[PDB]
Structures are given as structure tokens and as C-alpha cells.
């Protein structure tokens, strides 16, 4: 289905500090008030497809009990070319950059009747060739997990934010900027990506576009509001007047 991303997918474009100032930036942002594809898993048939990845992606989900495990980024996902395994399973967040013979159904085998443990490991066969490895982030995790991934100039920037929510069938109403998390300097090109799950699914997928935003910085840091300078004539006027 589709849902409306009111003012979601806003992140700190740069690493500088700004307070009590309105800053205009151009970058890959999620346009205000746009469909973000919403995915569900039915019990049978299982819905978890391979999604495109062009000029970044916006990811959101109402993760509960940490069902969402991680994501795969690549172009073929067949061990012919490089791939990514940003995932945290039970140890710290392990990132692998190698060639993997991904299975037809890559997921953590969990039997739902207490047997909520991974049994069938069909994620991949072997790393085979492999270029670079990164294992770090020994941190765990009605709450919304917003993520922004963008692959630019050989850097895989990732932004994240945590916030409790109360809505069920739609994105929350409000504003919350996404802080940078990591800056993997890989140096590849990505066309397709896919999430991971353990045996339901509820996560939204957006797409960043090159747009100019007028970001408002508050008395004491942080982005409190933003204006999409191409959403409508009123937003264009606001961007021109810097107010």
C-alpha cells in the first residue's frame, strides 16, 4: 500500500553546529508529503522482495522485539559482485563487505510454536572473496525506527533516530531530525537492497531526491522545523524570504 510521510526523513546534512539560524541546504532529501511504500508479511506466501536503490533510500519501521535484523546492499546479490551485510543479530552490529552466494530465501529461521530463536541460517553460503570488514557498535536496538541510507562519493552515510509512537496504520505526525550514525567509506555502487526478518513485517521505504531545504536550528541546537523549497508556491516564498 501507500502512506504519507508528512515531514519525515530529515537529517543533519553536515557535521557543523548551528544555533538560532535558518540554513538553506541542497542534498538528497525525502520530499515532503509523498508515498513511501509500505510492506506487510502474511503469516503460505511470504512478502519480502528486493527493492531498488537509487540516490539513497529512506527506511522506517515499528520494530518490536527487534524483528528487523539488518539490510543487504548491492547490485547483483549473487556473489558475482560486492555486497553489504549491515546487520546486528545477537552480538554487536557486524558489517561485512564480501561476495556472498545469497540464498533464494535469506532470513533467520524462527519457528512460531517458545521457539523464537534462529534455526535455519540461509543468509548466505560463504564470504568467498571479500574486501573489507567492520565489526563494532555493541549496542542493543510502540517505537519507530527511522533510517536514511545514501551512497555518495564512496561513502555509505547512515542516519538514524529513535522515538516512541502511538499510531498504527500511518506514519506519526510531527518532526524529528535524524543524526548521522556511521560513514562507511566503501567505494562501490548500489542498485538493489533488501531487509532481513525472522519468523508480521511492518516497515516503510522511501526514496531521497535532490532538493533544497530550509532547515531551522533552535536556540540550543537541533533542527526543529524544515521547509521543502519545491513542495508548493508558499514553500518557495518561504525559502526565498528565508523565513
Amino acid at each position: 500500500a501507500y502512506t504519507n510521510s508528512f515531514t519525515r526523513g530529515v537529517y543533519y546534512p553536515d557535521k557543523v553546529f548551528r544555533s538560532s539560524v535558518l540554513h538553506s541546504t541542497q542534498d538528497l532529501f525525502l520530499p515532503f508529503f509523498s508515498n513511501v511504500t509500505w510492506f506487510h508479511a502474511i503469516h503460505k506466501r511470504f512478502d519480502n522482495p528486493v527493492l531498488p536503490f537509487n540516490d539513497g533510500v529512506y527506511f522506517a519501521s515499528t520494530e518490536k522485539s527487534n524483528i528487523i535484523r539488518g539490510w543487504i546492499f548491492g547490485t547483483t546479490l549473487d556473489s558475482k559482485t560486492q555486497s553489504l551485510l549491515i546487520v546486528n543479530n545477537a552480538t554487536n552490529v557486524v558489517i561485512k563487505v564480501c561476495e556472498f552466494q545469497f540464498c533464494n530465501d535469506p532470513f533467520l529461521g524462527v519457528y512460531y510454536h517458545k521457539s523464537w530463536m534462529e534455526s535455519e541460517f540461509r543468509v548466505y553460503s560463504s564470504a568467498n572473496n571479500c574486501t573489507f570488514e567492520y565489526v563494532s557498535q555493541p549496542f542493543l536496538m510502540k517505537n519507530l525506527r527511522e533510517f536514511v541510507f545514501k551512497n555518495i562519493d564512496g561513502y555509505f552515510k547512515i542516519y538514524s533516530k529513535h522515538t516512541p509512537i502511538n499510531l498504527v496504520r500511518d506514519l506519526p505526525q510531527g518532526f524529528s531530525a535524524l543524526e548521522p550514525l556511521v560513514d562507511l567509506p566503501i567505494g562501490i555502487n548500489i542498485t538493489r537492497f533488501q531487509t532481513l526478518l525472522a519468523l508480521a513485517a511492518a516497515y516503510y521505504v522511501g526514496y531521497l531526491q535532490p532538493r533544497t531545504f530550509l532547515l531551522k536550528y533552535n536556540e540550543n541546537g537541533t533542527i526543529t522545523d524544515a521547509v521543502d523549497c519545491a513542495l508548493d508556491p508558499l514553500s518557495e516564498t518561504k525559502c526565498t524570504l528565508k523565513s
Binding site: K15, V16, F17, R18, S19, P185, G221
Partner: protein, 425 residues
Amino acid sequence: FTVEKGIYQTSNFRVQPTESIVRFPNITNLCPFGEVFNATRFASVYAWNRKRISNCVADYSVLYNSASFSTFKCYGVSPTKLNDLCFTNVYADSFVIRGDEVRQIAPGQTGKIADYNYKLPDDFTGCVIAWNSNNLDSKVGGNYNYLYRLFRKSNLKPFERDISTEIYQAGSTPCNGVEGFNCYFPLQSYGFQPTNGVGYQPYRVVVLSFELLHAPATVCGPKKSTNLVKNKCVNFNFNGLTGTGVLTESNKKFLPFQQFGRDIADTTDAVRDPQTLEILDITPCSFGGVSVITPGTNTSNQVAVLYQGVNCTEVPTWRVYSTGSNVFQTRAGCLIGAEHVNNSYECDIPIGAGICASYQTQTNSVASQSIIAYTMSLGAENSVAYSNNSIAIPTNFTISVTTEILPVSMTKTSVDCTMYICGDS
């Protein structure tokens, strides 16, 4: 040689830094520049190997001093200054090309190599290093393992690698399968032989590219970091962010990922010390115009100086006025050499904010003239004898004649543009 009475704006003044400060990350591991430049075998031109190097202390001095490099050209930087610069990361791209084609590797160049297999950006910032490797690469029997791309559908974007082996068609006719009419393989070997003269021998080429001011510094030169001091005019240098100002501990709520800070004018007004993760405020040392108050070369060589917009505590070759003994602080600035008084007269020399300067005795006694500073008086107080049923009527009159001067015109000047610019040429 004679200056009329008034107040005149002269050379500004500024607080010079007491010393210089550099704060670099205390990374220890040396950069694998030798390993990069030592590589057993260099990749082909079309498959130029790119090595990412970072998180190390780069010492470009030894590379520059080494005489084994025939060509050493830097474009966005200078080799001598490379030792004092901090980069986010550095790329080392190595390959072997024709000797005469080395000049083709400069940014914004044209030629087969630059247009097909290795293109550099027009705004390339880095250093290109090349040297003959005939004896080590070329074989007596003819080393042909080096391949280059000769044909491409279109010019490749800078820093693009093309490893395709599909055959090329040079005409309108289709080229199906692996061969066809006028179908040519895009990869052609190199005829490197020891007998070949200069310009044809293999040349080991390594390209060092690095970008600046887009992320925290990870590669830094071999500069010894010094101690840190604050509340003084100092030439700071954080991760190569050279500048001058007064450092001060700040209460800014920098987020963990935030390194620099910018004001509304978009200039560095806060930095994070690379060694210790603390937020320091950045403030340029005090400055302001200097205005001299004089009663005229006519009347006295005594003068008073005004450091407008500057606190008297803070205070030009001449410094005999720093001693003071009559330093006065005004909303306009610090006034030195003028005796403040508590009277009030008509404004003689305007200083600002209702303060004026004048030359008169006022003791410092009698007949001893000096420059005084006072709050100008608007006039003599008057209380009209207003009442109901009371009127004042003049019993006389005076015929007053006053003069009023009004400019009407100015001299006509005809400036010939061509004669003025290009006189008789």
C-alpha cells in the same frame, strides 16, 4: 603639514597573537606510502588499481626528497606545504603508461588515455608522481601484459574504471557475437621493449588525490602538536583549520558527531579540539578604528586619541599613550589624552554618544591649556513664565540681517574615456 581642528580617522589597530597553537590528532601509525609505491606489480591502465589510505600520519617530506621520481606535479596544493595539511582521506591510484603520455595525465587534458581509460577531474586536488620503470617492467623479449582501452562509446567520467571486454563496432553495421565486419577488440597491448627509446618505455605512475573540508581529518602531516591556552590572542590550528583569535571554553551543546561550529555569517565561531573532545569558542582578537582629536596645528601640537569600539582595559608603533593617567572610557570607545570634566559646553569636536572634546584651560590653576572631554549641553535652561491671564508683548524691535549661502553649480569637467584609459595608444 598643518591639520585643521577636528577629529580624524587614522590607521586602525589590532591585537596581535602572542604565539601560535597547533592541535593535531595523536595518531601514531605511519602511512603505507612505501608499501603503495613498492607494489610488486602495477595494474594496467584500463584496470588502474585504486588504494584507499587513511587513519595514518603522512610524511610527504621523504617522498618529495626521494630523487627516484622523474615527475612530481601537484595541482591543488604545494609539495612543500603538504607536510602541514590535514586531509579527510587520500587515494593512491597506480598504473603504468607510456612515457610520452605522462603529460596527458594532467587534469583537463585530451588524448586517448585521458579520454578512454583514466580521466582526472578539472578541479583535481592532489599530486601526480611518475618515474621510468623500463628496467623493472619491460622485458627483453617484449612485455605485452599491459593493456589499454582504445575505443569507447563515449568519454568516461573522471575517476571511472572500464573493464569491459565486449568488441567494438566502428560503423553502422551491427556487430553480433564475438566478431564482425570492422569489429575491433577495445583492449590493445603495449609494445614495451628495453631497446625502445625515451617516450615509449613503461612509466610507473601513481596519483595521489585527496579532498578537504568535507569531514573530520584522518590523514595529517608530521607536525608536533603543542599545548593549548585560552583567553589570549593566538594563531590556532585545529586539524589544519588555521586561523587567529581568542580561544575560550564554550557551553555550546555540540552533538557527538559535530566537529566545527558556524555563526549566522557562516564563519568558524567554535571548534572541537582533536586531542581532547571539548568545545572551544573562537573569537577574533579585538580591533577597531583609531581616531585622533586635535585642536589644529594652529593652536596646539597636543592631541587626544580615541580607540572607538574598544574597552580601555584592552589597550600602532607609538605607545607612549598606553601609560595614560587620563584614560577615559566612553560609549564611543576609549579616549586617551583628554581630561574628563563634569561641566557641559557646546559641542566643539564631536566624539560620539553625546561626548565632545574641546581645548581650554580648566586648570590642568589657569593659563594651562589641555584637551577636555565633556557631555555636550543642548542649551541654557529656560522656564517660560506661563500663566493663565498673563501675556508678554514686545515694546521694541530689532531689524536683523542674516546671510544664507547656497551652492548652485559645480565646475564642468569633460573626461575623455578613451584618452584617459588608452592615451595615444
